[PDB]
Amino acid sequence: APAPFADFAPPVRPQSTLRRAITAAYRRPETECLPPLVEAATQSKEIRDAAASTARKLIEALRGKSGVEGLVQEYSLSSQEGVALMCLAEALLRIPDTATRDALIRDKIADGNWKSHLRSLFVNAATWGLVVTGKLTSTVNDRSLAAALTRLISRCGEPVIRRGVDMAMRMMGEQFVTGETIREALKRSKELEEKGFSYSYDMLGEAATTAADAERYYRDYESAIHAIGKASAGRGIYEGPGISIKLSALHPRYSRAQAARVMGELLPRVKALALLAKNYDIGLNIDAEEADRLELSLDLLEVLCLDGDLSGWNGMGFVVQAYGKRCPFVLDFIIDLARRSGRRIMVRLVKGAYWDAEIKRAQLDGLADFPVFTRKIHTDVSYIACAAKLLAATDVVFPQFATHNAQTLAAIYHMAGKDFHVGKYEFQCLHGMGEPLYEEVVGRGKLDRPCRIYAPVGTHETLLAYLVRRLLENGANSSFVHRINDPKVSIDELIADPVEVVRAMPVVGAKHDRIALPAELFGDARTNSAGLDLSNEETLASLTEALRESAAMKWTALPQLATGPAAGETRTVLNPGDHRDVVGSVTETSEEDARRAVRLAADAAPDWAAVPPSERAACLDRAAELMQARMPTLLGLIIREAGKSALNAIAEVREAIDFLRYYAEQTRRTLGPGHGPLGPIVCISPWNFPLAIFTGQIAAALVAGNPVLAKPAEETPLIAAEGVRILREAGIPASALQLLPGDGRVGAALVAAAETAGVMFTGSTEVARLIQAQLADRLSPAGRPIPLIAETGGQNAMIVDSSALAEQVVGDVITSAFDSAGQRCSALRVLCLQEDVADRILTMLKGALHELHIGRTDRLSVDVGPVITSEAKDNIEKHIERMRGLGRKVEQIGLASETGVGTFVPPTIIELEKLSDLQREVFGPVLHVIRYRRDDLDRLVDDVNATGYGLTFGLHTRLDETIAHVTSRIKAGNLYINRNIIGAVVGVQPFGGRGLSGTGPKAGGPLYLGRLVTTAPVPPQHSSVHTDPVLLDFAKWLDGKGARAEAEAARNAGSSSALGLDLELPGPVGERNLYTLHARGRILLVPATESGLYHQLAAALATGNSVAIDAASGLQASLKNLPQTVGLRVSWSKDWAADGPFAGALVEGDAERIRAVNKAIAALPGPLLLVQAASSGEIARNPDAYCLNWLVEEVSASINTAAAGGNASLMAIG
């Protein structure tokens, strides 16, 4: 039995002094990075003047000497017409045969309806939009483009189509790439090679998703090396052409977490390509990618440079990104490696291509700082400083200065001084972008310095995939290429010396004012939880020791009553991934002590209620500090007790921290003397978020002033006991927070206890129904239903159309379906693929499936851990075998023998014929796939809704029409656009569904605390200026009937309603997080009096709902001659169970009438109903007898606005 965490994340090799200096700089504060860079980049006044003159000369030549602009001019096109035309030209070029395409244009496209003859034409419109307008729009307004394309064709006809086709053909065949194939690219390189340029070919592969894709990219590189080396014909690595590769193209799991696979499987592939480059004597450059791959790539560079089979060849090259804080230390390492190995490493210095993605990632992960600079001028200074370091080592490395910035170029040109020979260093530029600058540089008549052209090679599909990222390299507001084209930017501004400008700033190296550090994402409201960087070797080494120590601890969970720990039946808690690994011991609670705990809570309630809200909130904030400090140890417990991976355990502790701080802030914003607590609240939680959901429910109840009985899932008591220990250390009194470990019998005893004043339940819908049933014939001392929050299961779907990028879809599907072994309530259960792309995406998905590592989760390399119990495993496997027995296609990963010691289910894909093939939530790593025809999209949304669930939902599309359609018709609480559907963030995606998935209000949202007091406060930002028009029609009807007091109450409800609230919540860049209040649906009304019915109807209509009124009320004559608009929303119901499902209920009557109705309502099939009751007298006395908070439904929508390949908002941030 392997020791826990003994092999958690050992590095590839012991970290040298040079390597550790790199790691130390990873997230170094920006003010600490700049001063040494300023010092290193400093040049003499003589040089700075000479560089400025050269820079001015180059820029004057650039401005002294486009196709799309001339096309827009000739045909008077609007921007949308220009984009639509380029999309049409792109589509026409998918027709391979020239005569056939020309015939379609002449006889069909020009004459009118282009729709019939021509997957949306506008799939790549965000890319063409950048081309036409210079502005990035993340999604495509396909109805605007369709309108513009019809308009331009009907106005201008075949000539404009011809011009569009020929322009797109030139751009996609000769500008965005040097050629479609390596042979074509080589043929076109002769012209500039004769003038003194060289080439490095970029085959455009990246981000392999499957073994087959990595193999395809490998064979493309290998074939390109042969063609380039044949053409080099002995010219060598400096004069002759070379190749560039991306390591992410050569393995589907290129990551630090998979370091062993990288060294074992990716490294031999690079070596084979390098051996071929060596034989032809051409350059082979390793391109630089995301920041979390930098240090891992160094391990490959080290092995290759030390491998004697590659000796005698100096063509190995490596990119370093000057926007990165580690850049100078990476160069120190590379220069030393060059000295040790005797290989003259070709070092391409670039600024960096992934800036906006690095900002978003660091924010999402809650890390200490960014791994890149946040001011563009800082990158410029870094670049020049690293250039000085490189130019001092030309005996051992070959510097390659890749830049389009004439100021940067001139600074390095004069820095390098007067001595030059071919092979000392070179500049580089991008094909079809940098030639105007570099034709002022290459040649005996210019600056006589060589330039290597980075030459993309590929088909239209290949080049379009990540063209947005490449357009942003030189197209952002701060980009030199964009600025030199802006006539409002002077040459003096262009030649400004970044080194001196930074030096003279008040705070050298200050972070950009408009970019929040991850900890400050929420500003003054609350402090963001902090994560851990699992790509940082220092972090991995520190975490390894803390995790090991956590496994040595003797974790226990005891029934912690107000008077102290109680005796009970004790048993061990076993690691689900290996039952030989005992994690701790739990003493479980007798039914007698559970009842005793509620009585003690009831006796403790006044003392806890008297602690002022700000001080209760202070306890929560102290608890969050404690959990943040204890995160490494907490991770170890979650990993071993709950079978979670390290990344998921980090996210879980972060969620708990966020709950504590969010409910603390919401309390400080709202709670006052008039918001009295309910009393003892029973909090019952599931095993699958054994810290986060456990803590969230308890913290909310406590901060609202209620003593809590905490009943954690029987599977996961230890982390719950540790959460309670932390809350108590933070100042929560023992009488206010009691822990009752045990099974559902303990939960049921707590619910049934006489003094229970409210229940918070997260778990299965079936169990929630039993709790609902026990509460049905029960009332508070004030004669109202006992509040129940019941947040339950999902049958979560994702819809993917033919405009989505397969690689993005597959990554989001694999994560959403199989993260945590599918044991998230938010997990993806049903993937719906548009028929035309289904086979290609399915192939990729199955390939990605087999790249997952399943095993005990005390290893960083494990992607999917065990399921929680043997019972769960048997349940999940029974479902799989039933599907397999029905003839459905089933794909499964094979499991390692080591999994036999625990309870594992292999990630599984099941192909279904119809969504009805599924019955209930299958809580495991089981993805179901259905296909749909595009015209059936609306029916498909019906099918998703028809399950009765409504928790999470995902949509992958670039098309605004499809977004508007699908999001308006789906009925789910958490929507996700162009991203995964998991990991909802507290206060950013308030989490919770409708129907069979929840009663609400949402955990992590602003309505939550108001459910836990007897008089709900007004939440922050909670209002709407919109008035429901059916409510207004009803108020006029009431006035016409003479019911003046009820008409006024109706108008008051119309104003008080927050229906229509529509807010954007603060969160990370590159995402828009929206929170809206909608109608719940159809509310069951059970009135007793005429006035009661009118008040109930006003409340329901003001919140946008329809109603079913109990026909047994005998009040039909009270609603004669309703306006048609109101009548459309009103039905009368004799058999309530026939006329559902409902989304809530309003009841009027005395205590025993409420009890009888509540019992009948609980017996209705389907969703748990949030019921509100009032007496006739309370309706007369209290305008808020029925609280409008619970008659609206919260919807959270998270849209990935960077999905197109970049962040438009951050293009303005430099």
Ligand SMILES: Cc1cc2nc3c(=O)[nH]c(=O)nc-3n(C[C@H](O)[C@H](O)[C@H](O)COP(=O)(O)OP(=O)(O)OC[C@H]3O[C@@H](n4cnc5c(N)ncnc54)[C@H](O)[C@@H]3O)c2cc1C
């Ligand atoms: C031949 C060649 C090879 C390349 N290889 C790679 C590669 O392997 N890996 C890679 O990542 N990219 C690569 N690039 C791209 C390069 O990193 C730059 O993104 C791009 O060329 C623009 O930089 P610049 O010096 O041309 O222009 P500039 O306009 O001077 O510089 C623009 C750059 O400034 C940086 N920047 C912009 N805003 C900010 C900000 N707010 N804070 C901090 N920095 C900011 C970004 O890096 C941006 O690209 C390559 C470029 C060329 C020409």
Ligand SMILES: NC(=O)c1ccc[n+]([C@@H]2O[C@H](COP(=O)([O-])OP(=O)(O)OC[C@H]3O[C@@H](n4cnc5c(N)ncnc54)[C@H](O)[C@@H]3O)[C@@H](O)[C@H]2O)c1
């Ligand atoms: N909507 C959400 O936010 C959300 C979040 C996480 C999990 N879930 C759901 O939770 C389920 C998985 O978690 P689980 O297996 O722990 O759920 P579960 O229903 O089996 O148990 C949840 C808790 O209820 C208790 N319980 C069982 N019977 C009870 C009874 N008769 N009376 C009172 N308490 C009783 C259990 O001991 C446990 O503490 C899934 O269906 C998942 O979708 C929902």
Ligand SMILES: O=C(O)[C@H]1C[C@@H](O)CN1
């Ligand atoms: O996994 C998720 O989406 C978040 C919300 C809740 O389910 C707990 N974790």
Ligand SMILES: [Mg+2]
């Ligand atoms: Mg269960």
